[PDB]
Structures are given as structure tokens and as C-alpha cells.
Amino acid sequence: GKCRGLRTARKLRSHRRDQKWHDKQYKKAHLGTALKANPFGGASHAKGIVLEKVGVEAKQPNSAIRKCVRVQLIKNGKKITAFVPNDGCLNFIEENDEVLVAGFGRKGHAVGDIPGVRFKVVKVANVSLLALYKGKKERPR
Amino acid sequence: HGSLARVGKVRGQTLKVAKQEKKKKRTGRAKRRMQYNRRFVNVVPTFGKKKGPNANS
Amino acid sequence: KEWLPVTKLGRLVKDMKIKSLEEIYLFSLPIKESEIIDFFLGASLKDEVLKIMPVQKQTRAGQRTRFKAFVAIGDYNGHVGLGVKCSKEVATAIRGAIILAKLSIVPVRRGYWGNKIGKPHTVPCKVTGRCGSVLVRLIPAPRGTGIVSAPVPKKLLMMAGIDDCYTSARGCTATLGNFAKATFDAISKTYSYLTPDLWKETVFTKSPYQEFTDHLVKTHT
Amino acid sequence: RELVFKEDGQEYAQVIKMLGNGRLEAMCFDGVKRLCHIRGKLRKKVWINTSDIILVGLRDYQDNKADVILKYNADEARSLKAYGELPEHAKINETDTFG
Amino acid sequence: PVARSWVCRKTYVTPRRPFEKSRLDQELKLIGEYGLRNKREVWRVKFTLAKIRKAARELLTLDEKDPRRLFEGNALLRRLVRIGVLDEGKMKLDYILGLKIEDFLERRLQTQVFKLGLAKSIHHARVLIRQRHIRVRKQVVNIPSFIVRLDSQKHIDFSLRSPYGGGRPGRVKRKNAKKGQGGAG
RNA sequence: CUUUAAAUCCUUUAACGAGGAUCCAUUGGAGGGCAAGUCUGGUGCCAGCAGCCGCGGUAAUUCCAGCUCCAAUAGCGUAUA
């Protein structure tokens, strides 16, 4: 505190309000432009169906290609790119099929060597990818 | 080699070894008893540094 | 398993004349011999290592590496010490940390929270030390609470012997050497704080030299 | 060194533009263009010039971007031309190393 | 507007440090010494001991010679005497904070069954309580986390329906008797 | 038998009801943070793992499998405010 007076609270409150407004997390969490530009619309999960299966490489130090998928969302038709999570799961996902897609764990940012993408697929055709992985349940066809 | 865009080569070329039958593991309260016994009851005093429970060197 | 005391203090300690180390702390003699504390404090002086980190000075042909070991030693009923030694290998760095920590050892005082019943268990007041950018507070706690801190000052105050503390650190805490030296400096200055419990004027007892000058002129040149 | 042959999922290619960012574009034998992204083991040790025969794999899920596998010297290129695994339309136009 | 309770609370707390050597060694020592099932029990004993210590500290920070201090202090001391974790010699408010998890753990029914001599081990005491063999003041107890009071210590004996203290023999006795009748003809 | 408007469930109580007591406990992890193998085979900057540093280049303490081990335990992991 700098202005310390017995009859000074409105000045302190207004200055604290302005300096709290002039932030990053509070400015993102209390403005509508971020949620308007948010594809999920401030939600944990979203549905979508598959446009096509594409491939993108990694960054400079790591040399591999990561096989994401192109899914557009159902709430508002935003076309995003979601990363198919685990090994060999690109056979299970098909073109024009419903998927359940969630974030990857950095509040809407790219994670590691994958470029730009920030979402992952959790379930395809209302069955989980973990059940298709561990040999516990078979997908309908 | 075949191709590079093929997926699951390591999973599709893994030498599939089935699990062998083992005796069931005690669970609930007896596992805490066995852990307490093997960590605090039949231990010998040791100098230097203590090896881990899986140090198979 | 041998000792040749090169100093006058070593000869006085060896010849069964100076009773404890408390009067040596009282007159504030520089203890330039390591094994005076070994002779006074026996097997209760337990040691452990804090961190062995490498430092590198680069030369024309590659870079030369040295290892420095932070080691704290102390007795669980009072005295605590801390020592840093940088050498070539690791084992003699640990031994150098042992000898330099046993050189630099200080006593602590313990007080009470609120009520004075039984043995003292916590720090007498709010004491604070500082080295680098690290600021460490030691605040008294009620009986039976326990030390709440990072693990390194927690083990430092347990080897100090205090049962109850409240702490609040600030700065680059991850530098373990600066944090350990700041906690050691915070706990070392408890005898540098004046309290109304000891406002009375201390009677000036004589130095052990003043009574053992005859013994030292018999045993020395 | 050795005469490597292709397999199901790979074909040959001829470089059209030698481009930056670790990528280029090369034709197939029928003229379809696949965006070649170079393999990680062929980034600094070997160097790929313009209008030379290379080995480029294909994709089993899309046709938008391919990957380079290997490169061949000029003598083995004209030896592969002499066998007749490619039609009589493609000309190497005398590419080799200088002296 | 249904007429229900909607009142509940958590009785245990989880420490902020999940992986430390000395903490896991201490709870493993407590569990293996006193034959408990999981760390949720010692966590809930730590929680109720922290609540009692917080209440005693809140009473100690209030000034002397006040009716609320005396009322809740004497209520807490009478309660902890009734549990049996204290004696009448240490009947003081500042002596509450010098307690331990050990004193709250000795008052378990499982510990008293093992200590008096009904059972041979603490785990045998637990499984002996679980099969309904131990009764106190003419009421059987099937649960190991029962806190016995100081006056309830001398009433511990075997049940009138358990075969250990006199009653109908169990399933293996009658089956082995029928097997002996079949073998004898 | 009891409960209940009539029931169900709890408790009481019959006759049956276990020795690999198959009446078989999962969820994550094992480089550091952070508790726990420089174990054994396969791929060889490919497939992939990894919240972060980073691990994969034909001897991988990190990929994929077997054994052992660690964490919480009828619960555990993940995405979001």
C-alpha cells in the first residue's frame, strides 16, 4: 500500500479494480471475446463428426509425424483439428462418424511437439478408445 | 519396411506372449500386514545406502 | 585415532580443564579445531547430506567439473551446524563438508508459546535471517504442533532439536544452499536477541586462560 | 551400395522444386503431385538437388503429403532406366556430380 | 419440498504431500502395529485430533475467568476423561495439546480385545469382532472402530450366541459331526 | 417372523452355503519433480511416449509385451469452471 489515510478507501478500491483489470487471466476470464473465439464455448467436452484423416509433423527437435483428424463441432460448426491420442487408433476411427472430443490439458493451447492442435478424441461412435485399445469391448458395425 | 504411413507397426509386430497363471494377491487388510512385515520386521541393519525393493543389479 | 593439539584451546580441552563447550560459546573463542566438538559431543552428533551439486569452470580444452556438498550436522538437544566444501571428487568433498560443518556450530535457545510449563519446545520469539534473496522467518508454535516448512529447513530444525515452528519463506527458495544458510542464520541469532528474561547484568567470570596460565606455561614453550 | 526395390505403398519420384523448410514437391510416375516431407535421417548427411530420381512413400488414408525415403546415384538411375520399370517418356536429362 | 436430512460432512483429510518417505513410513508403522485396513482410518483420527486441538487452542487464546472458557474447557476435559485418553492428574487445558495419535488409538475396541487376552493377534481381534463374537453390557458388537469408555472396560466378555463363550456350535462343527456319523455308519 | 394402507429393505430366525476358501480387486505408474528394476525380448528419430524438462539414430533405466515392484483401495484416471 502507498496511499495510507484513514478516509481513503474509494481510491484504493478503484486503483485495485483497475490494476486487477489490467491482467491476463482475469482479463481472459471476464471478457466475452475469448469465449466468442472459443470453439467449445466454455465447455469441457464437445461432439463432432469426422471430415478426413490428415497428418502433421512434429517440431524441430523431435522427428515424427503425428496423425490428427479433422472434426468440425456440432454446436456451432467450427472446423477444428483434433489429435487421435494413442497408437494404432486411426484404424478404429472412420470418415463421417461421430466422435467425442475434449481438450488436451493446457486450457486451450498446444502441448509439446504437436503444432497448433490442442484437442484429443476420447470416444468414437459412442464407445471409448480405451475399450478398443485394451481388448475389453468391440465397436459396432 | 513396406510403408511409413502404416500405423501400429510395433503393436502389430510385437511377439505376443500370453500371461502365465500366478497365485492371487492378498488385498484389503492383509497386504498392509505383508508390507509392514517385509519393510519393518525381518530387516537387517545395513550400512552405506539402502537398496530399493526392485534393485535387481 | 590420535590427536596432537596445535592450539592452546585444544590443549585446554584435552587436559580435562574446560568443563563444557558453553563457556567457550560464552567468551566467543574461535574454535579452529574440529575435534573439540567431537570430544564434547559424542555419538549423538548425527549427520546427513542435503545436496551434492556440480559446478563447472570451463577451460580451453573442455570444461573442468567440481562437486560441492551441502552437509548439516547437529545434536538433537541444542547445537546445530552447517558446512559447504567444494573439492575434486565427492567423498573428500563430503569429508570436507563434515569438518567445515563441525567447525561452524552454534547453540540455540528454546522458549514457550503463551504458557511456561515443562521443557521448552519452540523458538522464544519471531527471529529472521537473510542471505542472498532468501528471507526465512521462525515463529513460535503451540505444543504438539510440529514443524511446517519445506523439507530442508524441517530437517534442519529437527536436528536443531526444536519440536514446534511456524515458517514463511520468500525469494528463490529452490537454491538449497542459500535456503539452508538463511535458515541457519535465522536460527543462529537467537542469542543475538535481547529479551527481558535476562535484563540483569551478567557477572564477569574470568577466562579459562586467567586460571590455567600456570598449566599452559608448564605445557608450552 | 545395394539395389533396393520398392514395395506396396512406395514409388519413385523426380524433384521439381528444391524448396526450404524441409519440404519439397515431386511428381509421381503418372504426374500426380505429392508434397514431399523429407525423412529425419536425410536432413544433413545427404543433399537432394533438383531433377533427380528419389524414393518416396505413399499414404493409405489421404493424398495430400508424402515422405521421401531414399536417393539413388546417376549410374544406378540409368541402370534402372535400362531395365524398363518406367515408360519411354521420362528423360533424366544428364544429371550427375561435377569434378 | 421433501422432508429429508441433507446434512453430511467428511470425517477425514488428505495431506498436501502425497509422496514423502517419513510420512508413509509412519502411517505404515501405525497400520501394521495396530492392525488397521487403510490410511483413511489414521487420516480420520488425525482429523478429529486436529479438531480437538483446534478447539483447545481456541479456548486457550480466550482470556482467563470467563464462563465460556470454563464451560467448554471442563466439557472437553470431562469428555476426554470419559474416553480414557487422560487421567484426573492431568486435568488441565494446556495438557490437551500434549496428546498423541497413540492415545486415541489405544482406546479402540480391537486394541482392547487384543490387550485383555480375548484374541492372540490384533488382526485376529479384528476378524473376531467381524464374525460377531465380542459383546459388552449385553449387546454384541460387530465393528472394530468402537470407542470404549473408562467404565465400559470391565464388561468385555464373549457373547451368549458365539460358540467361543458357550452356545450353538458353528458350521464346521456340525458338518464334521455329520461326516463322522457318515463314516461310522 | 417382523415392517407397511399393501409390500420391499434392515434386524431376528430356520434348513443348506469355502483351502488354489475360482465366492480369484481394479485404476494408474515405475529418468527427475514424486513413492517404485540401469530385468528380459521386438521396432530402430519409424511406430509411438511425455501436464514440464525431454525419451526414440540396429546395446531405449521413458515406445510395445512377460516377471517383479510402488501409490490409493471399492475405488482410480482424464477434460474443463
From Swiss-Prot, chain A:
Residues 1-25 are annotated as: Disordered. This is Small ribosomal subunit protein uS12. It holds the Pfam family Ribosom_S12_S23. Belongs to the universal ribosomal protein uS12 family. It is found in: Cytoplasm, Cytosol; Cytoplasm; Rough endoplasmic reticulum; Nucleus, Nucleolus. SUPFAM superfamilies: Nucleic acid-binding proteins. The modification N6-succinyllysine is found at residue 53. Its main location: cytoplasm. Hydroxylation at Pro-61 affects translation termination efficiency. GO terms for cellular component: cytosolic ribosome; nucleolus; rough endoplasmic reticulum; small ribosomal subunit. NCBIfam families: PRK04211.1 (NF003254), uS12_E_A (TIGR00982). The keyword Ubl conjugation applies. PANTHER family: 30S RIBOSOMAL PROTEIN S12 FAMILY MEMBER. Residues 1-19 have a biased composition (Basic residues). Keywords: Acetylation, Cytoplasm, Endoplasmic reticulum, Hydroxylation, Isopeptide bond, Nucleus, Ribonucleoprotein, Ribosomal protein, Ubl conjugation. The gene is RPS23. The modification 3-hydroxyproline is found at residue 61. Component of the 40S small ribosomal subunit. Part of the small subunit (SSU) processome, composed of more than 70 proteins and the RNA chaperone small nucleolar RNA (snoRNA) U3. There is a cross-link at residue 36 (Glycyl lysine isopeptide (Lys-Gly) (interchain with G-Cter in SUMO2)). The keyword Nucleus applies. GO terms for biological process: translation. One of its GO terms (molecular function) is structural constituent of ribosome. The modification N6-acetyllysine is found at residue 134.
From Swiss-Prot, chain B:
The modification N6-succinyllysine is found at residue 49. It is found in: Cytoplasm; Nucleus. Component of the 40S subunit of the ribosome. Contributes to the assembly and function of 40S ribosomal subunits. Component of the 40S subunit of the ribosome. This is Small ribosomal subunit protein eS30.
Curated annotation (Swiss-Prot), chain D:
It is found in: Cytoplasm. One of its GO terms (molecular function) is tRNA binding. GO terms for cellular component: cytoplasm; cytosol; eukaryotic 43S preinitiation complex; eukaryotic 48S preinitiation complex; multi-eIF complex; synapse. Residues 1-73 form the S1-like domain. GO terms for biological process: ribosome assembly; translational initiation. Keywords: Cytoplasm, Host-virus interaction, Initiation factor, Protein biosynthesis, RNA-binding, tRNA-binding. Component of the 43S pre-initiation complex (43S PIC), which binds to the mRNA cap-proximal region, scans mRNA 5'-untranslated region, and locates the initiation codon. This protein enhances formation of the cap-proximal complex. Together with EIF1, facilitates scanning, start codon recognition, promotion of the assembly of 48S complex at the initiation codon (43S PIC becomes 48S PIC after the start codon is reached), and dissociation of aberrant complexes. Belongs to the eIF-1A family. This is Eukaryotic translation initiation factor 1A, X-chromosomal. The gene is EIF1AX. The chain holds residues 24 to 122 of 144 of the full protein.
From Swiss-Prot, chain E:
Pfam families: Ribosomal_S4, S4. The modification N6-acetyllysine is found at residues 65, 115, 154. The modification Phosphoserine is found at residues 152, 162. It is found in: Cytoplasm; Nucleus, Nucleolus. Residues 161-185 are annotated as: Disordered. InterPro entries: Ribosomal_uS4, Ribosomal_uS4_CS, Ribosomal_uS4_euk/arc, Ribosomal_uS4_N, S4_RNA-bd, S4_RNA-bd_sf. GO terms for cellular component: cytosolic ribosome; cytosolic small ribosomal subunit; nucleolus. Residues 107-181 form the S4 RNA-binding domain. This is Small ribosomal subunit protein uS4. It comes from Oryctolagus cuniculus. The gene is RPS9.
